[PDB]
Design a protein around this ligand. Structure first.
Ligand SMILES: CCCCCCCCCCCCCCCCCC(=O)OC[C@H](COP(=O)([O-])OCC(O)COP(=O)([O-])OC[C@@H](COC(=O)CCCCCCCCCCCCCCCCC)OC(=O)CCCCCCCCCCCCCCCCC)OC(=O)CCCCCCCCCCCCCCCCC
Ligand SMILES: CCCCCCCCCCCCCCCCCC(=O)OC[C@H](COP(=O)([O-])OCC(O)COP(=O)([O-])OC[C@@H](COC(=O)CCCCCCCCCCCCCCCCC)OC(=O)CCCCCCCCCCCCCCCCC)OC(=O)CCCCCCCCCCCCCCCCC
Ligand SMILES: CCCCCCCCCCCCCCCCCC(=O)OC[C@H](COP(=O)([O-])OCC(O)COP(=O)([O-])OC[C@@H](COC(=O)CCCCCCCCCCCCCCCCC)OC(=O)CCCCCCCCCCCCCCCCC)OC(=O)CCCCCCCCCCCCCCCCC
Ligand SMILES: CCCCCCCCCCCCCCCCCC(=O)OC[C@H](COP(=O)(O)OCCN)OC(=O)CCCCCCCCCCCCCCCCC
Ligand SMILES: CCCCCCCCCCCCCCCCCC(=O)OC[C@H](COP(=O)(O)OCCN)OC(=O)CCCCCCCCCCCCCCCCC
Ligand SMILES: CCCCCCCCCCCCCCCCCC(=O)OC[C@H](COP(=O)(O)OCCN)OC(=O)CCCCCCCCCCCCCCCCC
Ligand SMILES: CCCCCCCCCCCCCCCCCC(=O)OC[C@H](COP(=O)(O)OCCN)OC(=O)CCCCCCCCCCCCCCCCC
Ligand SMILES: CCCCCCCCCCCCCCCCCC(=O)OC[C@H](COP(=O)(O)OCCN)OC(=O)CCCCCCCCCCCCCCCCC
Ligand SMILES: CCCCCCCCCCCCCCCCCC(=O)OC[C@H](COP(=O)(O)OCCN)OC(=O)CCCCCCCCCCCCCCCCC
Ligand SMILES: Nc1ncnc2c1ncn2[C@@H]1O[C@H](COP(=O)(O)O)[C@@H](O)[C@H]1O
Lengths: 120, 140, 80, 347, 167, 98, 63, 49, 320
């Protein structure tokens, strides 16, 4: 859909306009969930190699957590960028096509007739 | 075979019974020829005579299903005077299911094909009425 | 580096000649002073018609006639 | 095989697919497919038995036929457009031939008949390559030519792949044929959403590649190619039964798992385009896939089949197999649904 | 008749394809594909492709079909074939009869029935063959094409030595 | 369009139906596959020469080379099949039904 | 919670969710119009770059 | 001792533990540096200082 | 691991260490052939590593603390109960034979791993190539069923095909009467219950099936009971062999690399010993399987991977 939008400047994971956007906080709950997924990967890595699950290889568990948080931070940056691009294109298209988006006359319910259906 | 479906659906229900029966018979015959083609493709018959016997059997089975479907649907639309009514195709699909049971020489397949083909033909009539799309064009 | 070369020249002179001729094929065009003249002779060969320019008024380097002094010359190719 | 030769051949498989993904000229697309097939033939004949030679011969014949149909589609495009740009095609006959050729390369039904045979004939690692990496190049070509893809053709291929891949896996006890019919059904789901939103095509492709790589990595880690040898896993490695349980429940698309993520988004994109009957029947047909996944979970994790006495020897030895990325893939194939809006990174 | 010479060679080309595609024996199939390669070279030569036609002779017939007939001679040593052959021959000559009596036909695409001399260019190329110059530009402009083709041929050598070893 | 393209396309479809209807030999299938390639060569060549599209003149050569390399691979597969059963019959290649 | 707090928190929830719903409806209508007309930033399928055209004088004049 | 054969993981691979902790610390300091540079660029582009 | 594709790429070839003395020698004979010292004598003259004959607890000797495990965890079978009740109802006979085949498969993998990693030859006693001569000798005595022989042949068919045969096969001719004399002089009260027909079947499958089929793929040396007492004549015969048979001649670095990759992965070696063929002599049902597995995990040094057990004194686990 938006593939011609990111085709004049291809293969940019985060373009330069993405820096206009606020980055995800480090206490982002999505980023905390990705760190939790890294911790679960570290536990499964101890489990399949028959290491003691919570205790063995704390350096390896911490590199799992760190690597998932590291990749996931940039994935969340790109996610928020693409939804911001989606809304920017939507609003610029509505602003440039007023004949397709008229302001509908809102009626109050004193004029609005709705059919009544009795439950009896 | 898209024009076969068009010359089926162009005629209103309960108006011209013979041509609706012939159009549904031709749709059934085309479906039977497709089934026969893949049947002698993936499963080699023991002879040419066995192959043309399987082809004629499947083609006449599906053509008889289509014939009795279109006949029963148009007659039920005539005698009830309700052309835009899916109960007519429910009766027609059950008649086609009884035909498929009569060709396979079994009552249980007949009742099962009655129920499922009648509900399927009823759904096809409802989709023609409300404009339901199966291969919908991309719009957004 | 010297006993190995004499050993392979005694055993396999065909392969020594092959690698020597291939090495001279690779390195010597970068060391030749005449490699530039190959490019110059190829670009000096007129396969196409030299489509003339509209004289706008200010082109002092473009001649008005082939026998004019300005323009690309091939005295280097006649002399070499 | 020499390990250096294995590395060069795997890099050539990757190079052929990458050339398909980066090229703007149709001849280089065709060259990428030729390079990929030529390099992947030794990966299938890695173990040198008649089943691998039969699988490689069947694979060669189907992919070579698809390659010739692809080149004819390219040549008809050159007739009616005078150019070679990898974009929409300028003839419906060339569009049909290229869609058929790409469906043959994907093994979508009714060109599906090589995928269980070739997957069964080859080792688990090469079938991992066949079911995951070899889908990437034809899906990228389908991505770029979708303004010219006939809707009725691609949806016929999609529903026919979903139904045939659903019914095909019900009869199987071999794990490689189960993964092959599962592949056929998932490619049907990918092509069904392609003309509506190809971002969901990429999402279904990525989640499928993660889950299929997880299942092949579990099968390689336990040395199991049958249902009944996979049923011994509880008496040898009980964590692996939990992992195959959660991954097979995810491949069935059961929420709250990650394999619920593609089909839901696919339905979310097919009803916006007013197609209601088609994702309904697609989702109900995927219950066949879930049924034979549940068969495998019953035999492996949810019950304990009888073992043998010699299993007691294998209790004394740890798994020295490199189970590469298996905890990461197991986590991504199961726990990714709370991060469903990450899909916008594929736009 | 001589204004239709590319058309006549193309008829002989289709007749040769119906010859080997009906598959009498792989040696007669090899012979039919050889005769087809020769007449298709003649078609290419009559559109002015001298080098491409000589590549059909040197590489396709003299290189590849030699290896096909060689492997066939090392491996090898009807009614369906004859009926299939007369079927394809009658289909082809019905195509000929229709497109000659109508000067237009439509099987899948629309086809003119005039002699295919009509589509040619009416100028000259000077002191070069344009086809020779475009093939020569493989070394100047076709660098990436040279790289991917030569890498595929080296990999092809390696792949044949892998799968034919059995170890 | 021009009249020779009809016959080159018909040659492709004839060799396509030959390659899609096997009789017994794998070699006859490989011959139909290379007939398909030959017709693609001729059709590409006639287009490119008619259009005076100069840089695409190197295209059919590439189409030849790759496909003959493909053919080489096919012959090798046939030989390994023929090193198992004594013949190159396609009906011997049915172990993968179960 | 106080009834005031739950009441005004409900109003904040309703405003957020009604704004999200209106934006989803506008997003559907925008996607429909841009796929139909092709004049927006979305559904921009590639054409040939005109910077690939050679504009030099060729060997023959009539081109 | 206990084991009849010395296990591969009887002693910790100190090179691999050092590479693990160094790579993880590098990724954390690079992540915090990236995040601080991104909030500074956001505040500069939107004028919040 | 220690050896892999990377070490093969970075220079470790096994033909650098494959010297002339790198010979896999299997010594064979009947139940009291006296081969057990002969093998050791060969291994102390040629400088080879001697492996004793793999019993029920060979895998116990290679894993853990090296001490034998209780019989419910390793074997689930008894040699002495085979000597007492050969036709027993519980299926001890084929369960013992299948466990011994898996033990000899593990031992042959250990022997090939030592030979391909060090270049030192190995002297074995009754390898996997000669294990079947007990199987048939049981089946000819009615001790096991035909289905047990079918299971054995399936496991052997998909396991022994992956290995190379020995270089030298030494056989010791000892007649059944001298075997029984040495059994009665041994004093084992169970082993004195062996019948004459069983020993005669062992000798018949030795001389009629094993030695003819090993005469093509390797070099069979065959000695009587008294000429096997001189180790110097046997070592003189081994040192003057002209090795010209069997698939050891066409072994380059690639094939031996693949073989060394096989024989260091012991679960891949022992993969097809537990094939899902539900034979009543070897099938363990799920409750007994679960119970014996969970009792095995509670053994010391057996709960985790070997470097990860605090109860046997493994340190630095939080950094491993
Ligand atoms: C967390 C979840 C993932 C855990 C994975 C590893 C589990 C494991 O091995 O546990 C063993 C371990 C105890 O085992 P052990 O004694 O050390 O050694 C192994 C035993 O010997 C085991 O004995 P055994 O193996 O000899 O025999 C028993 C047998 C028993 O097994 C059997 O007999 C067969 C199976 C029985 C029936 C099946 C039951 C269901 C299992 C699957 C779950 C399905 C539902 C999940 C959701 C629905 C969708 C499928 O197998 C096991 O018990 C193997 C251990 C695994 C048990 C648990 C499996 C969890 C992994 C899969 C679920 C989680 C991931 C997917 C989630 C999907 C979507 C939510 O358990 C734990 O330590 C649990 C964790 C406790 C501490 C948690 C602390 C949390 C701290 C969080 C904050 C810090 C991080 C911050 C990050 C953010 C930074 C910014
Ligand atoms: C489809 C319609 C049924 C036609 C196929 C029947 C089964 C195949 C067959 O003929 O087997 C014989 C034959 C050999 O089978 P067999 O040895 O007889 O096996 C049966 C045993 O004898 C067992 O003995 P039996 O023959 O006495 O019992 C067979 C049993 C007959 O059952 C009985 O005898 C007792 C039950 C009474 C009949 C069933 C009543 C079901 C009522 C509907 C459910 C309740 C709804 C309630 C709703 C209330 C409000 C309306 O029928 C079935 O099992 C088939 C049930 C329906 C099949 C389709 C189900 C799809 C479900 C998809 C989701 C919905 O099969 C073949 O040779 C294969 C090809 C057969 C010819 C082609 C099939 C006909 C295709 C016509 C076009 C249909 C288009 C699709 C429409 C529906 C989907 C959109
Ligand atoms: C971006 C996409 C990234 C995709 C994954 C790329 C790496 C994996 C693929 C290749 C591979 O297998 O490499 C080996 C692979 C380990 O895979 P494995 O054999 O299955 O792991 C088992 C044990 O970890 C092996 O234990 P060990 O005792 O042999 O050695 C301990 C080892 C020692 O580590 C080292 O030696 C590392 C230090 C040297 C690095 C190179 C220096 C030059 O520790 C670790 O490797 C800890 C696990 C690290 C995490 C693995 C997964 C990475 C994250 C994947 C993306 C997750 C995204 C989630 C998003 C969710 C929402 C959509 O990776 C490493 O050894 C280094 C990981 C570094 C991650 C950096 C992430 C940011 C990059 C920018
Ligand atoms: C895992 C993350 C690794 C990221 C490394 C950097 C990759 C990169 O820069 O990719 C650029 C690409 C956007 O490039 P674009 O031209 O828009 O792609 C169109 C393709 N349909 O960006 C992306 O495609 C990013 C999303 C890729 C996610 C793949 C795994 C999920
Ligand atoms: C209505 C007429 C249909 C005629 C074509 C199908 C007849 C058939 O199945 O013929 C059998 C034939 C196999 O030939 P057969 O003689 O059995 O081979 C043994 C060697 N003597 O089978 C074949 O040749 C299989 C392919 C035949 C064509 C299939 C598609 C067209 C026919 C079915 C749809 C109409
Ligand atoms: C359980 C299965 C439930 C299936 C529900 C199907 C609902 C019907 C959908 C297709 C249909 O009938 O659509 C109506 C349509 C006629 O309406 P319209 O769009 O005006 O078509 C004229 C085209 N210019 O008609 C058409 O588009 C063509 C006719 C379609 C008929 C479909 C069934 C044909 C027979 C089986 C194959
Ligand atoms: C960099 C320039 C371009 C290089 C690439 C182009 C080369 C052009 C010629 C084509 C050669 C292709 C085939 C080469 C095969 C080489 C491998 C080989 O032949 O190894 C085997 C050979 C021993 O022969 P054997 O196996 O016993 O065969 C039976 C005959 N005795 O082993 C040998 O005899 C050893 C052969 C290798 C050493 C030859 C050294 C020659 C040095 C010449 C001077 C330096 C030239 C500059 C380039 C550096 C060369 C190292
Ligand atoms: C827009 C998208 C663009 C593209 C994105 C990226 C797509 C990635 C596609 C992944 C496909 C991976 C295929 C497998 C790797 C290729 C080479 C291979 O098969 O190596 C496995 C190797 C072989 O071991 P071998 O010795 O042959 O086994 C025989 C028994 N000894 O060793 C083994 O067998 C070891 C066992 C474990 C191997 C696990 C490998 C997992 C790799 C896949 C990870 C998940 C996919 C990537 C993440 C999502 C990307 C979409
Ligand atoms: C519909 C699409 C095809 C339309 C053209 C049909 C041509 C005539 C062939 C019809 C089938 C006859 C037949 O027997 O086919 C099977 C045969 C291979 O089977 P085989 O084992 O040789 O014989 C035993 C019988 N099955 O099959 C063959 O040998 C078929 C070889 C076909 C080669 C094409 C030749 C040109 C055909 C006309 C142009 C298209
Ligand atoms: N089926 C079997 N019957 C008797 N002994 C066996 C069998 N299989 C292996 N053996 C071993 O062969 C040994 C006899 O040879 P020896 O080691 O010389 O006493 C026994 O003590 C067992 O360890």
């Amino acid at each position: 859909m938006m593939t011609g939008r990111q085709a004049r400047a291809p293969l940019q994971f985060l373009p330069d306009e993405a820096r206009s956007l606020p980055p995800p906080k480090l206490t982002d709950p999505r980023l905390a969930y990705i760190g939790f997924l890294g911790y679960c990967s570290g536990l499964i890595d101890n489990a399949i190699r028959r290491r003691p699950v919570l205790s063995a290889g704390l350096h390896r568990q911490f590199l799992y957590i760190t690597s998932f948080v590291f990749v996931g931070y940039y994935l969340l940056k790109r996610q928020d960028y693409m939804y911001a691009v989606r809304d920017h294109d939507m609003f610029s298209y509505i602003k440039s096509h007023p004949e397709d988006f008229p302001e509908k006359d809102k009626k109050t319910y004193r004029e609005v007739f709705e059919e009544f259906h009795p439950v009896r | 075979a898209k024009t076969l479906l068009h010359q089926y659906w162009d005629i209103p229900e309960g108006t011209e019974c013979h041509r609706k029966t012939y159009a549904a018979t031709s749709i059934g015959g085309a479906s039977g020829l497709v089934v026969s083609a893949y049947s002698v493709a993936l499963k080699t018959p023991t002879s040419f005579l066995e192959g043309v016997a399987r082809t004629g059997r499947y083609t006449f089975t599906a053509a008889a299903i289509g014939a009795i479907f279109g006949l029963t649907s148009c007659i039920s639309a005539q005698v009830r005077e309700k052309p835009d009514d899916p109960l007519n195709y429910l009766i027609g699909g059950c008649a086609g299911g009884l035909t498929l049971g009569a060709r396979t020489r079994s009552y249980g397949i007949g009742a099962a094909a009655c129920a499922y083909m009648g509900l399927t033909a009823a759904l096809v009539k409802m989709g023609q009425l409300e404009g339901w799309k199966v291969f919908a064009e991309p719009k957004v | 580096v010297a006993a190995f070369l004499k050993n392979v020249w005694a055993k396999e002179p065909v392969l020594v000649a092959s690698f020597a001729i291939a090495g001279l094929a690779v390195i010597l065009p970068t060391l030749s002073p005449y490699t530039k003249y190959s490019l110059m002779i190829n670009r000096a060969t007129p396969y196409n018609y030299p489509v003339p320019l509209r004289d706008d008024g200010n082109m002092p380097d473009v001649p008005s006639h082939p026998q004019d002094p300005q323009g690309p010359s091939l005295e280097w190719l006649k002399r070499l | 095989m020499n390990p250096i030769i294995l590395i060069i051949i795997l890099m050539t498989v990757m190079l052929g697919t990458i050339i398909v993904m980066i090229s703007t000229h149709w001849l280089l697309i065709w060259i990428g497919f030729e390079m990929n097939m030529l390099a992947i033939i030794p990966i299938m004949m890695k173990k040198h038995n008649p089943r691998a030679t039969e699988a490689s011969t069947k694979y060669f014949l189907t992919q070579s036929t698809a390659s010739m149909l692809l080149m004819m589609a390219i040549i008809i495009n050159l007739m009616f457009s005078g150019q070679w740009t990898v974009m929409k095609l300028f003839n419906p006959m060339a569009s049909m031939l290229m869609t058929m050729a790409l469906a043959m390369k994907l093994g979508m039904a009714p060109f599906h008949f090589w995928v269980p045979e070739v997957t069964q004939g080859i080792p688990l690692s090469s079938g991992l390559i066949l079911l995951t990496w070899q889908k990437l190049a034809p899906m990228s070509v389908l991505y770029q030519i979708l303004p010219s893809i006939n809707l009725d053709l691609i949806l016929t291929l999609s529903i026919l792949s979903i139904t045939i891949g659903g019914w095909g896996g019900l009869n199987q006890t071999q794990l490689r044929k189960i993964m092959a019919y599962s592949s056929i059904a998932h490619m049907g789901w990918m092509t069904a959403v392609l003309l509506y939103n190809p971002t969901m095509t990429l999402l279904n492709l990525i989640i499928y590649i993660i889950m299929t790589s997880t299942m092949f990595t579990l099968f390689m880690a336990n040395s199991t190619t049958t249902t009944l040898s996979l049923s011994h896993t509880w008496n040898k490695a009980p964590i692996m039964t939990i992992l195959v349980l959660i991954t097979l429940l995810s491949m069935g698309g059961l929420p709250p798992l990650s394999g619920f993520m593609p089909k839901w988004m696919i339905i979310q994109e097919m009803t916006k385009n007013d197609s209601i009957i088609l994702p309904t029947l697609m989702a109900i047909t995927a219950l066949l896939n879930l049924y034979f996944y549940m068969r495998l979970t019953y035999s492996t994790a949810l019950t304990m089949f009888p073992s043998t006495n010699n299993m007691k020897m294998k209790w004394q030895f740890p798994t020295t197999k490199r189970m590469t990325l298996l905890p990461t893939m197991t986590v991504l194939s199961t726990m990714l649904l709370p991060l469903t809006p990450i899909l916008s990174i594929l736009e | 008749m001589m204004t239709y010479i590319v058309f006549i060679l193309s008829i002989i080309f289709v007749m040769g394809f119906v010859g080997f595609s009906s598959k009498p024996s792989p040696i007669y199939g090899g012979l039919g594909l050889i005769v087809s390669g020769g007449v298709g070279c003649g078609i290419v030569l009559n559109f002015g492709g001298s080098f491409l036609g000589l590549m059909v002779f040197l590489i396709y017939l003299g290189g590849m079909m030699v290896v096909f007939g060689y492997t066939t001679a090392m491996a090898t040593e009807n009614k369906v074939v004859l009926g299939t052959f007369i079927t394809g021959l009658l289909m082809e000559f019905l195509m000929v009869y229709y497109v000659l009596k109508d000067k237009e036909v439509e099987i899948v695409f629309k086809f003119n029935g005039m002699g295919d001399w009509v589509i040619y260019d009416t100028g000259d190329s000077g002191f070069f063959s344009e086809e020779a110059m475009g093939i020569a530009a493989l070394y100047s402009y076709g660098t990436w094409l040279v790289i991917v083709t030569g890498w595929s041929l080296l990999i092809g050598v390696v792949v044949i030595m892998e799968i034919t070893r059995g170890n | 369009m021009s009249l020779v393209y009809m016959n080159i396309m018909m040659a492709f479809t004839v060799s396509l139906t030959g390659l899609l209807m096997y009789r017994s030999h794998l070699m006859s299938s490989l011959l139909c596959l290379e007939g398909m390639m030959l017709s693609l060569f001729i059709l590409a060549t006639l287009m490119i020469l008619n259009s005076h599209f100069t840089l695409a003149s190197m295209m059919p050569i590439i189409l030849l080379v790759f496909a003959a390399c493909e053919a080489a691979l096919g012959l090798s597969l046939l030989v390994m099949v023929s090193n198992t059963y004594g013949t190159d019959y396609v009906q011997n290649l049915n172990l993968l039904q179960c | 919670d106080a009834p005031e707090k739950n009441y005004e928190r409900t109003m904040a929830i309703l405003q957020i969710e009604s704004e999200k719903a209106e934006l989803r409806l506008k997003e559907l209508e925008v996607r429909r119009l841009m796929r139909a007309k092709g004049d927006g930033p979305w559904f921009q399928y590639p054409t040939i770059d005109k910077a690939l055209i050679d504009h030099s004088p060729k060997a023959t004049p009539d081109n | 001792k206990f084991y009849i054969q010395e296990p591969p993981h009887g002693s910790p691979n100190w090179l691999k533990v050092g590479l693990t902790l160094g790579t993880s610390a590098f990724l954390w300091i690079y992540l915090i540096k990236q995040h601080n540079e991104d909030v500074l660029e956001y505040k500069r582009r939107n004028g919040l200082e | 691991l220690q050896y892999g594709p990377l070490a093969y790429i970075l220079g470790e070839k096994t033909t650098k260490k494959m010297t002339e003395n790198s010979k896999l020698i299997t010594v064979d004979g009947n139940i009291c052939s006296g081969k057990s010292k002969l093998a050791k004598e060969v291994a102390e003259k040629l400088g080879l590593k001697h492996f004793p004959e793999a019993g029920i607890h060979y895998a116990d000797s290679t894993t853990g603390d090296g001490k034998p495990l209780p019989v419910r965890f390793s074997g689930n079978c008894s040699l002495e109960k085979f000597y007492d009740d050969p036709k027993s109802n519980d299926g001890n006979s084929y369960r013992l034979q299948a466990w011994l085949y898996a033990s000899r498969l593990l031992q042959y993998a250990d022997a090939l791993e030592h030979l391909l990693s060090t270049g030192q030859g190995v002297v074995l006693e009754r390898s996997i190539y000669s294990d079947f001569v007990f199987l048939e000798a049981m089946y000819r005595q009615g001790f096991i069923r035909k289905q047990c022989v079918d299971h054995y042949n399936q496991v052997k068919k998909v396991t022994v095909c992956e290995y190379l045969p020995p270089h030298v096969v030494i056989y010791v001719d000892v007649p059944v009467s001298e075997v029984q004399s040495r059994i009665q002089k041994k004093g084992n009260p169970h082993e004195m219950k062996i019948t004459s027909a069983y020993l005669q079947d062992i000798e018949n499958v030795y001389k009629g099936t094993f030695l003819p089929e090993m005469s093509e793929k390797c070099e069979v040396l065959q000695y009587s009971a008294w000429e096997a007492e001189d180790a110097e004549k046997v070592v003189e015969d081994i040192q003057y062999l002209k090795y010209d048979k069997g698939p050891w001649l066409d072994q380059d670095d690639r094939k031996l690399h693949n073989l060394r990759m096989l024989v260091q992965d012991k679960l891949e070696v022992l993969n097809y010993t537990s094939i899902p063929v539900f034979l009543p002599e070897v099938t363990i049902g799920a409750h007994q399987s679960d119970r014996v597995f969970q009792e095995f995990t509670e053994l010391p040094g057996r709960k985790y991977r070997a470097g990860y057990n605090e109860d046997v004194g493994d340190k630095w686990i939080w950094l491993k």
